[PDB]
Design a protein around this ligand. Sequence first.
Ligand code: HEM
Ligand code: HEM
Ligand code: HEM
Ligand code: HEM
Lengths: 146, 146, 146, 146
Amino acid sequence: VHLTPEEKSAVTALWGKVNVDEVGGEALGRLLVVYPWTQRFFESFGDLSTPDAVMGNPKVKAHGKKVLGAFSDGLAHLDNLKGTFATLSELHCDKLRVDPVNFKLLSHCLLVTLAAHLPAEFTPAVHASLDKVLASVSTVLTSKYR
Amino acid sequence: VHLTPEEKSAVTALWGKVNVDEVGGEALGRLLVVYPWTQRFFESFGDLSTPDAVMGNPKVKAHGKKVLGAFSDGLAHLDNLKGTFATLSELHCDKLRVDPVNFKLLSHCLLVTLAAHLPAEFTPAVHASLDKVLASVSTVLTSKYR
Amino acid sequence: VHLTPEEKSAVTALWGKVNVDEVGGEALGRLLVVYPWTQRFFESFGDLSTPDAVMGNPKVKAHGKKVLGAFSDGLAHLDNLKGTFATLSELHCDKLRVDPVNFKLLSHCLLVTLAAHLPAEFTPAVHASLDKVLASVSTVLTSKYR
Amino acid sequence: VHLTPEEKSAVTALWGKVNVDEVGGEALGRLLVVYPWTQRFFESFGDLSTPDAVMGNPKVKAHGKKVLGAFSDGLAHLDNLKGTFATLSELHCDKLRVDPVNFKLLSHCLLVTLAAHLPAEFTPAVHASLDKVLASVSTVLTSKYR
Ligand code: HEM
Ligand code: HEM
Ligand code: HEM
Ligand code: HEM
């Protein structure tokens, strides 16, 4: 993540319009629907057998809202991503064994969801800037592996 | 592709609302802005140094339309993708040396511009159907490396 | 696979020197030691916490032999890979939810143990032929996700 | 890269037996042969049209020896990988546009080459340790992208 003042401000502005309740559950729901192998991490959540099932699942909705929260907290502290996400690095890596590529797939399901929700604001350059913030947050979460 | 009738027809239905001019250019434009290393393939196109520079660049837009037209045709030969993208596989593999990964990144830039242009239509289920078609077209255009 | 007679016969020839017992176990063992997140799929096997622990573990070795035997059979149906790995595709995709990426990582752990066991035979050209077969078997075992 | 004293010593010992002249050219030669799209970065080098052509190419041989050198220098300074490879980050990223995945493919072609050359020494644990050193050196070389 190497953001200029102009990039930080444009992602900041974008993010200020994001409804965290509805974008997080939709982002996590698209990962389980589109990339169906991710469902093995969330079977405790219940029935995920159809799109309708996934998107209706309140455990999904609630957890997704927990994810975006953590991410906004990441955005308030670009300068200390490693400090901010250190404990989530151990949960995901040492306890949950979340495969590194899934962080990238979740990143992808978040950018498709922000584009459908904020079409005017999700320009090629805000896309580029969020893509390297999301890339560095994913580097920090898989750091118990290297 | 393991498209059920519903999946295939939902893809067929969203695709008819796509404005090829508008979407092919932005899709290729987001590839070049977000994943800058891909610019080495399109040096020929002239100025690509700023988001505005690659987005409005007329070669980008032209090419964008050509990429989507070949995708439209592939969509109508869903049962025979291998056969339809056969000469494009030699071009990309043998003549152009395009990394397999870049086809995955372009597919992702396309799902993002589609989400932004058709938000109401871009439901998690058609996003999943479209990702499968996109993945199949990618394994076929990458055929001549394996 | 776009195996020329020479490629197919060179693969056929190296494969006949492979000691399945010795190589299947070490291949799966290197997956689990090098990419630890894969251990979540084989928790059933008991102790996998140390390199020595996963390497000598008898379930690892047993399974290793089973994975290579299915690969031997796939090799002798090079022309019909889709057909031969068909029931193993449902198992890995629908029942086990194995990430597509893990098939690429296992293929890599196998090329490394093969290099080590057959160094004189593991020439860049048979390494390339073997990587193509491995890639084709992977796109087929991943069929039921696309 | 999080190496214990025991890991550092075991990679150190391994590396002390590596013939840098012959392992670097073989590692770079396997990347161009096996992953043929990488040849677009090295066409100035000449004829790379066959395995025989690639492996005989002295520009390949010499460059490969330049790569491993840089890598041994990386190994002498784990504690400052970012300081050591900062200029190579700008050459590869801003001047050469080397796609991030190719760093991982080169890593892979180096581990297959060390296994064929030092079979006794290339144990599952030295493999695991070199894999995360190589992973972090590749993170540092693609850092102009994030
Ligand atoms: C890339 C951004 C990610 C962030 C910021 C993140 C954040 C979180 C947070 C805040 C928690 C702890 C709170 C809770 O227990 O609900 C958590 C739990 C968890 N995360 Fe992640 N996570 C990320 C990616 C992933 C990915 C890619 C997966 C796997 C597909 C994953 C799987 C899980 C699971 C299984 C739990 C436990 C859920 C439960 O039992 O309620 N996470 N994550
Ligand atoms: C989604 C898959 C893709 C499709 C359907 C596709 C389609 C096309 C088509 C239709 C042409 C043929 C132009 C002609 O000869 O008439 C072409 C050319 C080309 N493609 Fe692709 N392509 C795809 C992905 C890529 C990717 C990922 C790259 C590299 C980043 C790429 C780079 C090129 C280049 C450099 C040319 C020729 C440049 C020029 O027009 O002067 N293509 N592609
Ligand atoms: C190179 C491709 C692979 C082949 C040819 C292969 C082959 C096999 C075979 C033959 C079985 C069937 C056992 C039976 O029902 O009789 C099996 C089971 C299984 N495979 Fe794979 N497999 C491959 C890759 C993977 C990967 C990448 C993973 C995950 C890291 C995986 C995880 C499993 C698991 C967990 C089982 C069942 C566990 C048990 O034996 O109790 N496989 N595989
Ligand atoms: C992962 C380890 C890598 C290291 C340590 C590394 C190191 C080097 C070094 C030391 C040079 C500068 C000296 C010279 O000009 O010969 C160089 C040049 C270069 N590297 Fe890399 N490199 C790495 C990966 C890659 C990869 C993956 C590619 C692309 C497939 C690549 C492509 C090039 C090219 C094209 C040059 C210029 C060669 C010439 O014109 O002579 N490098 N690299």
